[PDB]
Amino acid sequence: VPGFLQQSQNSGPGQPAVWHRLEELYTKKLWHQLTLQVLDFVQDPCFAQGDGLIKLYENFISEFEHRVNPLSLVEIILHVVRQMTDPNVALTFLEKTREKVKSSDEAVILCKTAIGALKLNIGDLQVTKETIEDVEEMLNNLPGVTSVHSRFYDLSSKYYQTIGNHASYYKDALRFLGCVDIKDLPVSEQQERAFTLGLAGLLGEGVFNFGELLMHPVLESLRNTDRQWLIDTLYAFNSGNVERFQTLKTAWGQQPDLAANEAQLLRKIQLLCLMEMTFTRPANHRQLTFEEIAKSAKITVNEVELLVMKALSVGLVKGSIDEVDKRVHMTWVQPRVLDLQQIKGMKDRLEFWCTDVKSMEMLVEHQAHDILT
Amino acid sequence: LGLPTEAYISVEEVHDDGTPTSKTFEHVTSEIGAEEAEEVGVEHLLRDIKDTTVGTLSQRITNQVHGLKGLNSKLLDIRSYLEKVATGKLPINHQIIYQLQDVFNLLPDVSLQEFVKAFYLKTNDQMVVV
Amino acid sequence: KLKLKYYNLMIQLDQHEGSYLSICKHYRAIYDTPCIQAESEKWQQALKSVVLYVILAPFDNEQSDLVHRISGDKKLEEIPKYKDLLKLFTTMELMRWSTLVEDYGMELRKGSLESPATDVFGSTEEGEKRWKDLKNRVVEHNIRIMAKYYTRITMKRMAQLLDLSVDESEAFLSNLVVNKTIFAKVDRLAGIINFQRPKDPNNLLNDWSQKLNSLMSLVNKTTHLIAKEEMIHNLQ
Fold first, then answer.
1. Which of A305, A313, A320 sits opposite C151 (nearest CB)?
2. Partners for B (CB, 8 Å, 3+ pairs)?
3. How many Cα neighbours within 13 Å face the side chain of B73?
């Protein structure tokens, strides 16, 4: 057993130097500073034929030590699988590490995420959704680790790559956008990451605008690195609606995948302006006319029916349409976004209600304060 | 400002931002009540103000309390709305700020038109009673 | 399971003359025989024949949750005719009746399964009865949403929207208004016709109880405002 790690002690120049300490770590029988130093060598890029041979000794360690968490065993097996190049024998060994390790901390979440990360070549679609569904089910208690939820996004994003319900990708990427605390990775990756995220999130039919989360503070720095045609057209889907120049500009910027959802985006902004036209005016004065909708949406008078009534089916407005003069009577509204100047005028609309009730009610009981006693 | 204490229930709401699940206790509305003997003790222990009296002082004092305590409620609460934006960032703002404040902007809500019809209709309602 | 097969004998009696409602739950009773099958053509033709009689039965509260019980099955959506049949039912809106003839005129050429065309268009008089019934169901589907949105409308715009003559509009508005499903107001000479609305006390229920029903959310404003405020402030 000692000679098995002695033949692998020298991986090249400078390796036996720190390995003289590495072999002195198990002589004192401490496997933890040994864990951090070996994992550092595993994290250290190599051929790597060193970790493939020594993983049996690390397995022998896990045998009689019976303790060390499978987390480090998943971190080493994801480095070894890259050099093994065969996912099948990696699945047999990883599932072996899943069944042979048990601890108070749940090992099913880290093993299923490792299986899902190694399932990209299977290729997909067979057992994927089953184990991917099991990840977050076992993650519900108790999600205090915060580390594995990013791996849940990894297997869920690769689950989305089949396309795959675009509307769901923003929810999964939201889970990632909130999972990782500090980015600690180059923005050059996150600029296209938030780009295709903006594409799949905007082209989704379930979300017509959601201009609020477009302003989310952690993704706005990623949008600053992005070209401003995407941010400006996201403001067109935030307010707009037409703005025919910007909805075409996103076709100038992004050629693919837009040709299918282009007409869907046009329908989404045609139902988007209906809330903002009655919301922008002080009003209400919530009754509009056919000339207002047909001129703004630049659609024929026969299709404004389908237009406004589809928005009634979306749920953003409950209003009714007066078809004698072809007027449109809006009811309620769908709140979207709105600014510190609005908090100020909000205090004006409030304080006016304050002095109203204060004055009048203090006048009410001013009359009857005498007779009470 | 009113009914004392408070109630918070333990629940996991996660978030719309998909953060790892964290627990922000949801507010449970609390009300004061009693059954029989717990009514006997306190109802004799008041010995303070007239009871009720029904119809005269009751509703109008409630018009003072619920009205004026509603004024300083939202006042100090809107004072926290601006103060949190001025100091305490982050978040702070986001999240619910834009949607909640737009819910405040849901209804201004004045006439024309049908609200003018409700006026003299309400006048037609006071007809019968007077 | 011969007694379950006798249902296929009794569907001839219930569907024969006057009852399109009796086939609702009973065509779901004959649907249990393909569940044991072990059959292909009769099974697939049972899926379409049981999903295509929705137009036959008149509109009723039972017809909504009825088609909602069969909606969502993994075997049902395989037919594009179910996609069109579901498209018209959900969210309503408007679709050209000629396009509805295109999708329902190809079902004679479509198949595989000939059984829906045998029950619907297999008989000349019964097929024509279901042609005018289909006309009454699609125009009532238009009236259902439009009447709830009126307020008022115009006669000429109703003629071009319903794709039928003004006298046919008055005919469809006549037999729908005697059904007392929607109380209308129709005058063709002035051109201004209107459907609904309450027609309530209305000076107490409508104006008072609804306005101060919104004042429920107005007095609950600050209550749930400070709630969600503290919610977003605590977690970050």
1. A320
2. A, C
3. 17
How far apart (Å, rounded) are the C-alpha atoms in residues A269 and A242?
Answer: 8
Q: In chain B, which among 75-104 make CB contacts under 8 A with chain C?
A: 77, 80-81, 84, 90-92, 94-97, 100, 103-104
Enter the DSSP assignment of C208.
Answer: I
Exposed/middle/buried for residue C178 (C-beta within 10 Å: 0-12, 13-18, 19+): exposed
List phi, psi (to 5°) of A203: -75, -10
d(CA A219, CA A208): 19
Q: Which of A310, A320, A326 sits opposite C93 (nearest CB)?
A: A310
Give every CB contact of residue A201 below 8 A, 6+ residues apart in sequence. Answer: A166, A169, A170, A173, A207, A210
Mind telling me how many Å the CA of B79 is from chain A's nearest CA?
8
Query: DSSP class of residue A214?
Result: G
CA angle centred on B50, ends B47 and B53, rounded to 5°: 145
Give dist(CA C231, CA C208) in Å, integer: 34
What φ, ψ does residue C135 adopt, rounded to 5°?
Answer: -65, -40
* Resolution of the experimental structure, in angstroms: 6.8
For tokens 């219930």, name the residue. Answer: C14
Which amino acid would we find at residue A353? W
Rg (CA), chain B: 22
The first and second tokens of residue B29, run together, are 């509305």
Cα–chain-centroid distance for residue A305?
36
Secondary structure (DSSP) of A140-158: SS-----SHHHHHHHHHHH
**Which stretch of DSSP H or E encloses residue B9?**
strand B8-9
User: Under a CB-based contact definition with an 8 Å cutoff, are residues A75 and A42 in contact?
Assistant: yes
CA-CA-CA-CA torsion sign (A242, A244, A245, A249): positive
Adjacent-strand bridge partners of A288? A328
| H/E element, A173 | helix A166-179
State the Cα–Cα distance between residues B62 and A367, nearest whole angstrom. 16
The strand pair at A327-329 and B26-27 is best described as: unpaired
Q: Which residues of A touch B91 (CB under 8 A)?
A: 217
Q: Where are the alpha helices (DSSP H) in chain B?
A: 37-45, 57-86, 97-104, 114-129
Q: For residue C190, give every residue at least 6 positions away whose Cβ sits within 8 Å of its Cβ, in sequence order, or none.
A: none
- How far, in whole angstroms, is CA C117 from its chain's centroid? 20
Classified as helix, coil or strand, B95 is coil
Beta carbons within 8 Å of C119's beta carbon, 6+ residues apart: C15, C49, C53
Using what technique was this structure determined? Answer: cryo-EM
β-pair type (C152-154, B26-27):
unpaired
User: Comparing C-alpha atoms, which of A135, A229, A210, A115 is closest to residue A171?
Assistant: A210
Contact C57, C15 (CB under 8 A): no
How far apart, in whole angstroms, are the C-alpha atoms of residue A63 and residue A60? Answer: 5
Q: DSSP state, C205?
A: I
R_g of chain A, CA atoms, integer Å: 30
C91:A313 CB<8 A:
yes
The answer to whether the CB atoms of C227 and B27 lie below 8 A apart is yes
Count helices and strands (H / E) in chain C: 13, 3
